Structure 1
Amino acid sequence: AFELSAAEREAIEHEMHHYEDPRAASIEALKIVQKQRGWVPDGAIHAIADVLGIPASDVEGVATFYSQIFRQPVGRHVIRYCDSVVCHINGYQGIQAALEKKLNIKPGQTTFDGRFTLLPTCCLGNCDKGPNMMIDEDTHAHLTPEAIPELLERYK
């Protein structure tokens, strides 16, 4: 049983005002639900579709198209390490190995206490300061495998 909160519904309608078609608010409606609840659960697809007046199949096609809209439950903090070409040259593999050793999980997995979800991501547009990674809204550059356990500890 999914119900959109008042804050979620008002945010979705306010974003509906920004376009000439309410369908154009589907991505940000999914992002609003994800920001409130960590991810987009299954009933949120039908709730968002009902608010925007578009089919649930379109909402789910959007949600499963875009990589940053999570349709599976994640941890409290999403680590997104860049695995693209410049960070590969700058040695993201050591960063990924350090993250895997500290968290004892694989990419795409969530730690057993629900704290961290480790994810590869495409280039973060910070290639001159690589290797880069992204915790929830914070980007960390100039990464070394030694600074990974200290820098992960400030996200509780």
Structure 2
Amino acid sequence: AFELSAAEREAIEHEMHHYEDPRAASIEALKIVQKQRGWVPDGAIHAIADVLGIPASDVEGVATFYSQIFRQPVGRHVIRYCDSVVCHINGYQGIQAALEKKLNIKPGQTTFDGRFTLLPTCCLGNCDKGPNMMIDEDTHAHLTPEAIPELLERYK
């Protein structure tokens, strides 16, 4: 039973002013809805489409293409660990193994209570500063397996 809220709708129409076409606001509109609800539900695809004046198959095409826009329910805190080449040399596999022991899940899966979802991600742009991970909008560098339980405790 999806409805666009009156503040999400005003935020989408705020960014339609900054482009020639309202089609250009589609990425930000998906991120606006996901920021409020954790993920983009199925009824939000038709909701965003009718506001922007583009077909729903165009909105769904964009949302499935982009990795960060989520079309499946996630946890309260998303853990995104780097698995690219410089983090592979600095020991990401030990970080991945420590994350799979504290959480008792596999990447792509959420925890049973729904607190955390574990996802691999590309290079975060922090390659010189060691193995890297992100929890929500927070970047943690110089990762060690011993640091994994204390770091996770902050996010409840």
Work out whether the TM-score is over 0.5. Answer: yes
Give the 5 Å matches for 1:17-96. 17-96=17-96
Write the deviation string for residues 110-141 of structure 1: whole angstroms up to 9, x where unpaired: 00111000000000000001200000000000
* Gap regions ≥5 residues in structure 2: none
How many residues align structurally? 156
Moved over 2 A (4+): none
The answer for the alignment partner of 1:97 in structure 2 is 97
Write the deviation string for residues 82-107 of structure 1: whole angstroms up to 9, x where unpaired: 00000000000000000010000000
Displacement of 1:25 in angstroms is 0.2
Write the deviation string for residues 26-77 of structure 1: whole angstroms up to 9, x where unpaired: 0000000000000000000000001000000000000000000000000000
The answer for the alignment partner of 2:107 in structure 1 is 107
* Gap regions ≥5 residues in structure 1: none
Local SS of the residue matching 1:17:
helix
TM-score (norm 1): 0.99
**Cα distance in 1 for residues equivalent to 2:16 and 2:62:** 16
Name the Cα RMSD after superposition: 0.4
The answer for the alignment partner of 1:149 in structure 2 is 149
Q: Percent identity?
A: 100
**Cα distance in 1 for residues equivalent to 2:88 and 2:153:** 25
**Cα distance in 2 for residues equivalent to 1:50 and 1:2:** 13
